[PDB]
Amino acid sequence: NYQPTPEDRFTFGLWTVGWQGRDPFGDATRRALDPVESVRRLAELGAHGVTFHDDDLIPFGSSDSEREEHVKRFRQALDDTGMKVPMATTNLFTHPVFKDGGFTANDRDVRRYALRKTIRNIDLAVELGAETYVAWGGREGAESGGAKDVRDALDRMKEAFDLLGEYVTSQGYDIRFAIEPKPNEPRGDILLPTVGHALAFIERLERPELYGVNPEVGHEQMAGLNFPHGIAQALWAGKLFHIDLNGQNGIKYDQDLRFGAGDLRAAFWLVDLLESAGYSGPRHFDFKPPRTEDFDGVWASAAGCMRNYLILKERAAAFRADPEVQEALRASRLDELARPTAADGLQALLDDRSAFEEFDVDAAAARGMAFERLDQLAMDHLLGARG
Amino acid sequence: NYQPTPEDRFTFGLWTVGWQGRDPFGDATRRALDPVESVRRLAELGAHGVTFHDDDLIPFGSSDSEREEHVKRFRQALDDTGMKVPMATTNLFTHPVFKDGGFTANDRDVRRYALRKTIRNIDLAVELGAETYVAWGGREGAESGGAKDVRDALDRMKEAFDLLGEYVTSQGYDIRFAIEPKPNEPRGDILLPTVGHALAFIERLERPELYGVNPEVGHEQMAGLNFPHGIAQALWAGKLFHIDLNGQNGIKYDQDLRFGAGDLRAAFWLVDLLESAGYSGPRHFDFKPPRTEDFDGVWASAAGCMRNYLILKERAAAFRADPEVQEALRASRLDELARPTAADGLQALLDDRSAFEEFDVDAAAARGMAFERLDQLAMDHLLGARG
Amino acid sequence: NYQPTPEDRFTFGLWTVGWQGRDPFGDATRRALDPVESVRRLAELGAHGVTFHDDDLIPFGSSDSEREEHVKRFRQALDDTGMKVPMATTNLFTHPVFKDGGFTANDRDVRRYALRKTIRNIDLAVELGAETYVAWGGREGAESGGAKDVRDALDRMKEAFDLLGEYVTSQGYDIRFAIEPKPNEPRGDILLPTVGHALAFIERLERPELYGVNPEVGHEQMAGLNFPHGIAQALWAGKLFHIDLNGQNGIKYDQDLRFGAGDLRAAFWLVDLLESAGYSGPRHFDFKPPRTEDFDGVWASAAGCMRNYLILKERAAAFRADPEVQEALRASRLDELARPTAADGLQALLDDRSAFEEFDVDAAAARGMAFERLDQLAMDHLLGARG
Amino acid sequence: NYQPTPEDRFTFGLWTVGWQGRDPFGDATRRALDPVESVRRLAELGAHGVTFHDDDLIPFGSSDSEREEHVKRFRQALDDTGMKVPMATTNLFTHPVFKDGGFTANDRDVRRYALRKTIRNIDLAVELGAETYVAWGGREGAESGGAKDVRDALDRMKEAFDLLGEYVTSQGYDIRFAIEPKPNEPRGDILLPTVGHALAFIERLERPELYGVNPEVGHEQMAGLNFPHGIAQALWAGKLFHIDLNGQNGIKYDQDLRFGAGDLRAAFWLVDLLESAGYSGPRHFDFKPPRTEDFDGVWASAAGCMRNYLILKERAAAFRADPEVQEALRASRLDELARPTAADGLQALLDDRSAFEEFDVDAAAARGMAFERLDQLAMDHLLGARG
Ligand SMILES: OC[C@H]1O[C@H](O)[C@H](O)[C@@H](O)[C@@H]1O
Ligand SMILES: OC[C@H]1O[C@H](O)[C@H](O)[C@@H](O)[C@@H]1O
Ligand SMILES: OC[C@H]1O[C@H](O)[C@H](O)[C@@H](O)[C@@H]1O
């Protein structure tokens, strides 16, 4: 059971399985993977596709012809396997020139360079068939309060994304942008640190319809936030364009554990939500096989990502289909939450004495919500302990 | 030095100095304060004004005539002292009926009751001259994932605020709404948990211009977020309608320490920002004198709030006026952050070979940002150690 | 399946199911429970026993004869049901007199009073057959740095516990003490904030053998610590005298969720450890049924505590009995971790050239730990997805 | 003012100022520093000394004669400048062989290698005159629960430290060990994660007198703990052998900011404590100049460490010498905290009716602690705002 196939739409970044294990306190524990080899290994495990930063696919500073050759070999592997490229992104974080940011570097020349590097990869992404272009502003931020005027920085951020929107519109490209929040690391505080901040920012862009969010499980958890709540807000706004799936154990460094590790209950409620809402985008994993692992462990970790999603999907589906759960949901008045509070309108509400003057506050207060019983039914379903 | 006067616009909630010291593990340590007495004591310390929830001023369940009498006595104290009431709010959290929320309770009758309780206090607030009406959804949330469908809850939240907006518009009242985020406590996760989430939500209301945010120092810090960054985003959006000032030591329960306690450097950078941006609203303190304190300690704690703001204001002003700091800010290219990245437009950027083909990436990378020197000048100014 | 019986040794505090739902922002949602009624309800659910603070059983300020009568009625219920009282504790936190602590209050008279209140309840506990007496220093701490000289406070803490040890020794009582850490709440920082700090402190008492720890799942998680690691250290030291079981979602206020809620994987690894190590003490639940719940929800929440332990016990047992897991544990060299590094002694180690001069560092480095495969087998067992 | 001299005993690790700026998301921004150059630059800024890991001074895998030459050149720089080497440590974290630990690696051969690498550097440290040898178990831990049996791991940890203690005793070396805790990073959870856990562990070693702690400001703050409280416990136990000074903004990745940055009030209370208790060891800075900085910024950041200590020292000293503060400390009964609760003994306490039967609980409860006034005097002193 729980065998993935390409129709489950599981995708992986090249940088995930290709992570060599260099951390801030130690050297690489694994050799570099050829992108072609990752493509084939992932196809064999049942993945749908891969994603890339520019610099994962084409070594930084490659000539135009080295570049052609890298793309050609990759494209051949995609053709041989049937793997897709639904998303791409830019590396605006590794090279030293990006030490104070890309789009919001204090140096204007760096900001211009960041835009040009990005635009060149948008052309490549469209050529490979990507529908979503992710921006992760990992260096946009500060360690000290005087270093970054945040209002000016947001003006620069909006300028950058507006220009990118003008570019795609002018070229007639069919690609949308997704902003990936993260609250900190590697900068002390990162700009647009949560899904909320990103959603609010998007509404001030010149063409807000071209921009959504790419939330990551572990990033929101680094701020102690409820990830399924955040995703529900993004879905409610119509802005869940892509998602990064992984695990995280609490408020600490960005662990990027395989999906299902970390906060397992939150993973269950995330799956429940994605599947109930009909999210139809890629189930993308942004994870790092731990540096303890050899190559066999790398592939085992990747497989476990997919396995854990398909297990949780089954459990959530059983939960929602259970008539005893359906009855519980009514006992807890989930049905009533979905009805309008005042479809009769404001004047009717104001004239309704059962809403205030004659509302029996004590009787309403005495009614239990029956949430603990509901939650235990959810636990029993997750654990497969329904007698 | 550092004596406040009413022109500094310092305000306090009645619930702040009036907090009796009941916590989840212990009984009250102080007797209840009469609102009239708080008004006079605060006027003597140099405050500008007070704020209230409905239930702080009028005991829950008062008759129409007890209500009149409470308001009359309060109004007399305001007239005797010259104190203003710039803000008011509703208690939709204390009474048991609000155990699952007000605006987003699963029970529809409770939601209607929450709206009616709110509207009655909006009329009172306008009569007392409040310009801002705060909403803190402290019970809107969940302890378990199945208890609250978050999409439906946001539909209900938007319904409630839309109706309030219709009400104020229809009455011709000159009052705006400010949403006060908090990430958790007393619910396991609270809806709209940060300034970002609140800002994004506001953009989906029918009349977004009537709604802003009332961010609180300690609340954003409960998610480990940078408070001055959050306020800069709110100012950038034009939505900083009011602010709650206090202190918080990290990610834990909501401490509500006096302003300046907690993260002192963040307090300095907040003051710097508010004063540089010309925020002209109330400097409102939402703090709890610790339960260790008697009445003399209560007034000492309140006075310290004001004192610490005026000290930090002086230090920030000295920082920004220091020519050596002005030179540092140029050395760190803050000037350049404020200039447009590409006022020449997209086509010019694309044709500019100095932005990419001929950009010397190594030379740009080698340039230091000089941020540590700048930050030490900021430290020296804060500490009054400029030789 | 998963029906508890008294032989599973599940115990509950009277304050758990008896929590009325008063939180720092709201009033009680449930009426007070008679201790006799809790005893009978818990006996019917299959619990083994109950625990109490002095003030849960005997209202503060009771006369000697009211006291007798309270104890008599409780004792009758214990006799009627077969319920035991394995643990007792003192309330040194609720009454205002304890606002700055009990054992470490700055006022010496309060400290003496705290000792006398404690000793009176130790006599009661011994009469009811308790084997463990818990001390939770919830008020021992500070909100500000100058308020508490911590060295003097630790001298006072050690003085208090030494005196209690002298008391029990002098009376010939067969009772041991267990210190329950918590890092913060209701004080800004609490003394002995983690299991580590408590263990270290115990070693400086005059009779360290009489003192152990009473760690609580949610408390260690409030500091972002791994609870099963902490318990392993306490077991290694021979100091796990009692345990508090509950759930907690990350670094925030003390939630006291039912056991199994919160961090579900950590619950699995805790059960695995307790059962593998042969912990033979009570499985005590210190939880709060959420205030959303009526009485039916209270009992459902309590039942779920027990259910979730018995499910996890079964899953952990299946994990460790699985031959494929046993083989995995060898592949990951858990066997080798259990062997002495240098049973040959220091000189032999120093003369062993295969340990250094001729150690092939590259070959050792290339070996994968196979941890991800092991962890996925653990996941599959937890979820009941072993094909 | 605030010019350091070698008598202030400020020390720096070679790895601090020598950090090249490689982080988990980016390449180095600065070239490698020769240790000789760091020694001379630091001597010019007024430092007392430097500290080293084996691998900072002697490139891993050096021959015996390269090794001699590295040590000779370093020793010459020490002789030229008058700089001391008070502390040394081992790198048991960088090389891939240490991916699962040094002392607690599951592979027994790695554990033996870790011991031999350590012993070789203890000989070097003694030759250079170090009095303290630090052990930071950065790789001792796990990402998953099944990977590390923690009891066995602690047996292995104790074995390793016992053997080191036997080694130094047998050689007659005058050097003590200090364990440096950290709660996580680069492992998901690290063993002995706080000062408490380390202190408790030390008490189970064969010769506990040879072992103390090397607490780091930012590490304890990564668990949300109060650093001055932790240090007070270490001083109370007589185990503060060395300290790492730096700054950290809350619960996140290990920032290693310059001292005084981060939580500035905690820095003030730490300085107050160190100076009041007469700590006479090195004031060692374990900080990372941010990667935004060039070499000029590196030296500015290092200088700021020292400056900020000397400013805080002056402010704390002024605080404690202020007669108005001395009077406040009596008003808050700090004097009484320092007196024994029951120097009269247990029987006298039991017979003292003023301790219980006739204690007026209400009168004691009504007395305010006056802590807020005290804390504001502390604030005013820190800020230099005493009129
Ligand atoms: O944006 C693409 C990716 O870039 C980097 O690898 C980030 O660490 C990751 O979280 C993000 O998803
Ligand atoms: O909204 C008004 C106030 O209501 C409550 O007292 C909250 O605890 C507080 O943070 C908020 O500012
Ligand atoms: O010590 C007994 C109990 O006292 C209080 O109720 C605490 O909140 C709880 O954690 C502790 O277990």
Ligand SMILES: OC[C@H]1O[C@H](O)[C@H](O)[C@@H](O)[C@@H]1O
């Ligand atoms: O133990 C010596 C040092 O080793 C490493 O550099 C650690 O990151 C640091 O915290 C520690 O102080």
Ligand SMILES: OC[C@H]1O[C@](O)(CO)[C@@H](O)[C@@H]1O
């Ligand atoms: O470019 C205008 C900008 O200039 C600043 O005052 C920089 O000093 C900003 O805070 C504002 O967005």
Ligand SMILES: OC[C@H]1O[C@](O)(CO)[C@@H](O)[C@@H]1O
């Ligand atoms: O009222 C329509 C709503 O109904 C739900 O499906 C409730 O099941 C929501 O998730 C959506 O906002």
Ligand SMILES: OC[C@H]1O[C@](O)(CO)[C@@H](O)[C@@H]1O
């Ligand atoms: O009672 C002796 C004690 O006195 C203090 O100096 C109080 O000033 C302590 O820090 C020490 O433990």
Ligand SMILES: OC[C@H]1O[C@](O)(CO)[C@@H](O)[C@@H]1O
């Ligand atoms: O070496 C004895 C050790 O063996 C284990 O059971 C390993 O299975 C430990 O938990 C204990 O410390």
Ligand SMILES: [Mn+2]
């Ligand atoms: Mn991540």
Ligand SMILES: [Mn+2]
């Ligand atoms: Mn990601």
Ligand SMILES: [Mn+2]
């Ligand atoms: Mn607050």
Ligand SMILES: [Mn+2]
């Ligand atoms: Mn507030």
Ligand SMILES: [Mn+2]
């Ligand atoms: Mn608890």
Ligand SMILES: [Mn+2]
């Ligand atoms: Mn407990």
Ligand SMILES: [Mn+2]
């Ligand atoms: Mn560190």
Ligand SMILES: [Mn+2]
């Ligand atoms: Mn350190």
